[PDB]
């Protein structure tokens, strides 16, 4: 494969957790900066796992 299926599964897991943490942050009126930072951290995890 061009793409690692295990890694891609981690991308889906992380997309889910991302929309989850996001839904929380909007529930708690969290500042945009910190949210973007959690997302950058999740993406970084995706690249690392890849």
């Amino acid at each position: 494969t061009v793409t690692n299926e295990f890694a891609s599964r981690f991308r889906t897991i992380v997309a889910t957790l991302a929309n989850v943490v996001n839904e929380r942050a909007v529930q708690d009126d969290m500042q945009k900066a910190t949210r973007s930072c959690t997302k950058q951290w999740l993406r970084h995890l995706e690249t690392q796992f890849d």
Binding site: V2, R11, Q40, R43, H44, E46, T47
Partner: protein, 50 residues
């Protein structure tokens, strides 16, 4: 194509894509000669973003 290591975490990564597009415009011929090796990069950009 000279190898390009890009993960495409952050949106800024679009720079790489734009690079290829410019190379497709300025040098359509040479790009035609390396477009598969380019498609290996774009496939990563697409699997990540879409």
């Amino acid at each position: 194509l000279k190898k390009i290591a890009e993960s495409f975490e952050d949106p800024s990564s679009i720079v790489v894509v734009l690079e290829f597009i410019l190379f497709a415009l300025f040098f359509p011929t040479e790009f035609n000669r390396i477009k598969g090796d380019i498609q290996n990069v774009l496939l990563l950009f697409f699997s990540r973003w879409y």
